[PDB]
From a paper:
The proteolyzed complex provides a high-resolution view of the core [name]–[name] interface. The [name]–[name] binding interface is quite small, burying 491 Å2 of surface area per molecule in the full proteins. The area of the [name] Ox domain most distal from the dimeric interface (residues 223–231 and 303–306) makes a small interface with one end of the A domain (residues 1321–1323, 1468, 1512–1513), burying 491 Å2 of surface area per protein. The interaction features a network of hydrogen bonding, including two central salt bridges, between [name] Asp225and [name] Arg1513 and between [name] Asp231 and [name] Arg1512, plus side-chain-backbone and backbone-backbone contacts. Single point mutation of A2(R1512D), A2(R1513D), [name](D225R), and [name](D231R) each leads to disruption of the [name]–[name] complex, as observed by gel filtration. Peptide synthesis assays with [name](D225R) and wildtype [name] decreased oxidation by ~50%, which confirms the importance of this [name]–[name]_A2 interaction. Isothermal calorimetry binding experiments between A2 and dimeric [name] reveal a Kd value of ~75 nM.
Residue numbers in the entry:
A (entry chain A), D (entry chain A): 1297 to 1435, 1439 to 1571
B (entry chain B), C (entry chain B): 129 to 171, 177 to 255, 259 to 319, 321 to 323
């Protein structure tokens, strides 16, 4: 019924010139991302990467990282996000435990001269039942397997329920080692929306400034992040671009709902 | 010690004009109206005066989402030579914090923003800047009237945090913003 | 990368205007025409924009002998509050030497001269001067158009030896001239 | 048929508010000059000044001097102009030789508080055949007597021949000890014109500047003065206010006529 990369591949056809992901002054359209990830995927295949394999990807906050994640899935493998801020001992444990074949960094596309590969659609490899990624948690770290189908069902249920479309902008706050980021990336790219990436998730004043400056419409984090963000905002601040606040967690600080609706009046607050 | 006739004249684009600050945030500015309000600096020969045929005032505009038929939101550089609008930035957007104090709600209801930048090249050697400030008032007054030929409201903004507007437009060190204008009303 | 409509608009007081430099030195400006061209800054509420409702641009005019029905030659201070013209000097007169270089024959054929002076009082603290330069361009553009409602030719003068014009008008130390205009044509 | 002051008195009625004489920023209308000279005339009468007397007047380049000259004539006496730049020995010789009763200076009106006298018309005293002034010459100095009638005939012949009227402005270049100045003063005031006085007759650059700045229409001097004035003028200078150049003398430098008509094209050059 669905894989994560096919969902995006289909949307690249519908809207080739829509901006898919912006970091700062860098950006990729839907066809640039599709083209370059096809090429990296072919490069990975020349390295024996295919079905059943696991590929480590350093979770740098760069648009090229999105290229790499998509390429791993197009080559038929599952990606294991590696936090670039973790100590080397923790990174090593996760790479061994998940039986990763290689580790991918950003700048891969340029310094291996991968523009020289064909940028056309690949032969399908991954099936809905195959693993799409492995998330490690509670850092002792336990890796959880997630299939293409389970992830697709989640992101599409959300896209349909709240009518995410081309006019939407998602702010990429959470680490791509965290499960919430799978919606930030593939939910955005399945609906034709734009992902706006963030350099530092701890710079609260820049998080709320990015919401105004780049017209963010969708906020998808744990409750704690939104709470800390609203401490670095003016008393009479009010933003009308944010229409959807997705909060995942059971523990919400008591005045936060009232706070969200004072500084984000258009925002619909969802506690899933 | 003389007195003058207060008896005459038919001011239509000069008296029917006034600093507007409330706009219909629902009706889009028809692609015709917009493309004509911008006809004024069409372009060498222009429709307004300029010290020494220099015309150094480069004009930019910001467009809010879906409030001007036929124009995606973003920052544009209008070209006189072509009567054209090239996109320069469609990811960023001006925010209330770029304005200040009394000007928060003006920009709120606004549909688009017009920016007048002094292209600091030539002939006068630091008096061309003085001549540019007058030219910005010349340009402002023509637009405000032509906006009365079409029921487009206008309001001048004296000061504003051009600190980052400067970069979203990709201005040089020889380009300095002088004036800004917020521009349908009811 | 966008294109705009070059198809529309009806510019009448904006395109039919242009820097005029040849005048009929024989026909006087009818007391009506003159008193209406000067209606523009009638006056608080005016017919043009001004930063912060300050309107600091004081306007003066020089009139050549017998070239404006109903006005003796001399230097006058127009009053907005009254729509009036008080004589300030009728013995002295501006001469070709007050202008320079290319502007000798412009003043020659001219009928009258309009002077825009920045009354340097208040609120902005040395930014009101910047706002005044824009207001002079605002005023200039309204006049040039209203002068097209009446076939009065106009031409801006950037620089000019205001050294003694300064005294014939009895300007203060807080009054600084910014712009001058020479104003029927054929 | 005519006296010099009656000619002016009649014109004061026709045009009371016309400017009669301007120096720098000082000026008098036709009625101010008539009023104040009536008062000074009464003050002179209280000092025994009347018919047959001679009154010395220092020829200061001030509007008050005009007041004094007119007052002497209204009191019925003749005035003897005294050059303020002459040595005291020459001034004394002229005052004795002409049997002057008193010597008048400017500031007389203020410091004797003469505004306290009646400013209305006086009873006529002087007759056309009475002496109006005494001009001394060839400075040894010989005083020449001139009657009211001889002076009136001269100034009126000129006013009529060249149609001098209210629109005209006379530049007062020549000393009021010189005969040419009688036209500058009384010819101007007989026709309703304006006299523009000059501080220093030797400042050539200011003479030609006054012609432009104050719209001089009539120039009445000896040929030498106009010649020296045109040495301090630009190559492409051209003035259109000057319509009449009165030159009195037999000796005209050869290129001067051609020079006058290059820098004063509207000017009619008269060699009387
Ligand atoms: C150069 C200039 C700058 C101005 N800046 C501002 C501004 O920052 N904020 C504002 O509210 N109005 C501004 N105005 C408008 C005047 O404050 C005010 O509207 C004035 O009354 C002109 O409009 P009126 O025709 O209604 O008077 C500006 C006007 C001018 C000419
Ligand atoms: C601020 C300003 C100062 C000007 N100064 C002069 C000047 O000193 N001499 C002159 O001949 N024209 C002057 N102009 C007019 C322009 O040089 C020229 O006429 C320009 O082309 C505007 O008229 P246009 O509509 O014919 O182009 C000035 C114009 C402006 C706006």
């Amino acid at each position: 019924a669905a894989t994560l990369h096919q969902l995006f591949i289909d949307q690249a056809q519908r809207t080739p010139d829509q901006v898919a992901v912006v970091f700062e002054q860098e950006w990729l359209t839907y066809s640039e991302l599709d083209q370059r990830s096809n090429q990296v995927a072919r490069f990975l295949q020349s390295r024996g990467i295919g079905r059943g394999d696991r590929v480590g990807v350093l979770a740098k906050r760069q648009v090229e990282t999105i290229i790499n994640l998509m390429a791993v899935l197009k080559a038929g493998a599952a990606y294991v996000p590696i936090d670039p801020d973790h100590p080397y001992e923790r990174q090593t444990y996760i790479l061994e435990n998940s039986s990763c074949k290689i580790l991918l960094d950003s700048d891969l596309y340029e310094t291996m001269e991968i523009s020289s590969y064909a940028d056309g659609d690949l032969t399908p490899v991954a099936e809905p039942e195959d693993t799409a990624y492995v998330i490690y948690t509670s850092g002792r770290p336990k890796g959880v397997i997630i299939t293409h189908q389970a992830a697709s069902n989640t992101i599409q249920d959300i896209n349909r329920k709240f009518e995410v479309n081309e006019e939407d902008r998602i702010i990429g706050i959470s680490s791509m080692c965290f499960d919430l980021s799978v919606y930030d990336i593939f939910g955005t790219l399945s609906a034709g929306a734009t992902l706006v990436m963030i350099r530092d998730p701890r710079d609260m004043r820049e998080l709320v400034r990015t919401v105004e400056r780049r017209g963010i419409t969708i906020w998808n984090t744990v409750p704690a992040i939104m709470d800390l963000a609203l401490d670095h905002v003016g008393s009479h601040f009010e933003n009308i671009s944010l229409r959807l606040v997705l909060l995942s967690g059971d523990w919400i600080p008591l005045p936060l709902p009232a706070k969200i609706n004072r500084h984000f009046p258009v925002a619909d607050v969802i506690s899933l | 010690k003389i007195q003058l006739e207060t008896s005459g004249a038919l001011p239509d684009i000069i008296q029917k004009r006034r600093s507007c600050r409330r706009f219909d945030m629902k009706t889009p500015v028809s692609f015709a109206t917009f493309s004509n309000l911008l006809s004024s600096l069409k372009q060498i020969l222009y429709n307004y005066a300029s010290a020494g045929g220099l015309y150094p005032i480069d004009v930019f505009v910001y467009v809010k989402p879906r409030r001007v038929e036929g124009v995606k939101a973003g920052f544009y550089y209008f070209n006189p030579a072509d009567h054209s609008l090239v996109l320069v930035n469609n990811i960023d957007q001006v925010i209330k914090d770029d304005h200040e104090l009394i000007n928060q709600d003006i920009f709120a209801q606004s549909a688009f923003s017009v920016y007048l930048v002094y292209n600091a090249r030539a002939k006068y050697g630091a008096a061309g800047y003085f001549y540019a400030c007058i030219e910005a008032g010349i340009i402002t007054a023509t637009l405000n009237m032509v906006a009365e030929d079409l029921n487009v409201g206008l309001c001048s903004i004296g000061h504003m945090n051009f600190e980052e507007i400067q970069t979203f437009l990709k201005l040089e060190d020889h380009q300095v913003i002088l004036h800004a204008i917020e521009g349908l009303k009811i």
